[PDB]
Amino acid sequence: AMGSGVLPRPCRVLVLLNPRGGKGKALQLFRSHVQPLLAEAEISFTLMLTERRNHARELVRSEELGRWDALVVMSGDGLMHEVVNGLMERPDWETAIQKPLCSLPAGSGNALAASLNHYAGYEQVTNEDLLTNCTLLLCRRLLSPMNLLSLHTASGLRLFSVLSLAWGFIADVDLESEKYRRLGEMRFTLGTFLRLAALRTYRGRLAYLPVGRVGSKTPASPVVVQQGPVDAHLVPLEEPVPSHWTVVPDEDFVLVLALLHSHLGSEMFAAPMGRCAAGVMHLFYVRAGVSRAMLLRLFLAMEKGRHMEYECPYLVYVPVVAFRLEPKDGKGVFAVDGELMVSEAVQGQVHPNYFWMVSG
Numbered sequence: 001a002m003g004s005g006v007l008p009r010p011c012r013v014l015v016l017l018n019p020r021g022g023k024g025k026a027l028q029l030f031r032s033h034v035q036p037l038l039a040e041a042e043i044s045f046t047l048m049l050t051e052r053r054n055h056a057r058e059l060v061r062s063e064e065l066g067r068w069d070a071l072v073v074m075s076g077d078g079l080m081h082e083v084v085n086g087l088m089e090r091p092d093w094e095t096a097i098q099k100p101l102c103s104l105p106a107g108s109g110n111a112l113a114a115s116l117n118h119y120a121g122y123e124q125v126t127n128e129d130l131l132t133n134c135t136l137l138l139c140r141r142l143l144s145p146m147n148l149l150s151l152h153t154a155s156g157l158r159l160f161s162v163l164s165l166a167w168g169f170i171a172d173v174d175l176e177s178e179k180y181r182r183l184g185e186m187r188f189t190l191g192t193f194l195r196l197a198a199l200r201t202y203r204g205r206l207a208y209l210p211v212g213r214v215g216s217k218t219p220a221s222p223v224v225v226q227q228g229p230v231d232a233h234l235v236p237l238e239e240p241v242p243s244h245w246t247v248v249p250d251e252d253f254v255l256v257l258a259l260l261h262s263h264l265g266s267e268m269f270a271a272p273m274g275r276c277a278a279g280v281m282h283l284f285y286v287r288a289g290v291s292r293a294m295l296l297r298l299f300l301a302m303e304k305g306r307h308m309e310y311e312c313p314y315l316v317y318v319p320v321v322a323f324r325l326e327p328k329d330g331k332g333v334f335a336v337d338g339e340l341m342v343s344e345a346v347q348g349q350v351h352p353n354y355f356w357m358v359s360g
């Protein structure tokens with residue numbers, strides 16, 4: 001996987017850092033593991049600290065982007081989510097979203113970083129090693145375009161996702177996990193085991209548009225969007241999905257996962273079938289009926305990306321460009337790039353190669 005662009009040498013970057021990350025050690029880690037590499041690479045930087053809710057989002061929304069060669073985001077997937085949404089909320093979003101971005105991991109919730117490390121051909125590492133590897137990619141300066149997920153909720157909120165949308169088991173493991181950050185990446189194992197022992201299924205309606213079913217025509221009247229891009233594949237949540245979509249017959253699920261990248265976490269190689277093409281994401285779902293033992297084995301095999309070798313009949317994988325998910329029985333709880341989100345229904349479509357990341 002070759003680069004499709006490069007940062008100039010020398011260059012200067014804005015570092016948005018959350019000082020609470022890495023158990024309050026992010027700034028220390030920047031000084032010890034990032035700064036010295038940046039110096040040898042002739043990367044000049046400015047540190048801006050962002051910890052409060054929508055602060056990084058607001059900062060990026062108002063920034064004079066022409067003074068920077070890239071924005072480096074040092075915290076986790078959540079902060080990247082904010083930065084990308086900030087960029088897309090601007091009136092000049094079509095040029096702003098083209099400013100290269102870089103993810104440097106601090107603490108847990110670094111799926112994006114873990115994905116990029118994997119794509120560069122590094123071993124699956126965590127903590128300091130991951131941070132060093134991701135800094136090395138920044139120092140090598142190569143860029144690659146990345147897909148972007150546009151999401152619509154039943155309340156009419158339109159938002160963007162850089163990594164994932166999860167519902168059911170996976171989202172519940174996030175809720176259970178948060179109270180064990182102290183354990184680092186072990187917290188997902190704990191959360192998973194707990195939820196496995198108390199396994200439940202979720203009622204809902206899933207439809208999607210697989211890649212090979214995309215034609216030359218889109219729906220006559222798609223969803224109305226305040227600011228572009230237009231989600232041409234999507235029709236309003238009040239209308240049925242177009243007839244060329246697949247509507248899953250099964251309405252009972254253990255989980256649904258839309259995933260743009262290889263990794264769900266630094267020790268979770270969820271999508272080993274290869275890097276998504278431009279405008280495509282991974283869709284997984286698990287149908288009710290799997291045993292707790294088989295789910296356990298799928299989870300344990302995920303670390304090495306071997307879970308698909310089981311050929312579990314309850315696990316379905318399809319490459320898609322769009323999906324719709326409607327939980328039955330009131331609102332469902334979703335995780336979007338690791339963050340909680342509750343809604344009666346969500347749908348989304350992938351936009352091809354919309355932003356640029358430093359990567360190997």
Ligand SMILES: CCCCCCCCCCCCC/C=C/[C@@H](O)[C@@H](N)CO
Pocket residue numbers: 077109110111163164166169170171173174188192257264265270284295298299302307335337338
């Ligand atoms: C896809 C293969 C399915 C095999 C079954 C096993 C599933 C258990 C996986 C639980 C891990 C949940 C933690 C990650 C949550 C995500 O929202 C991240 N974006 C947060 O960092």
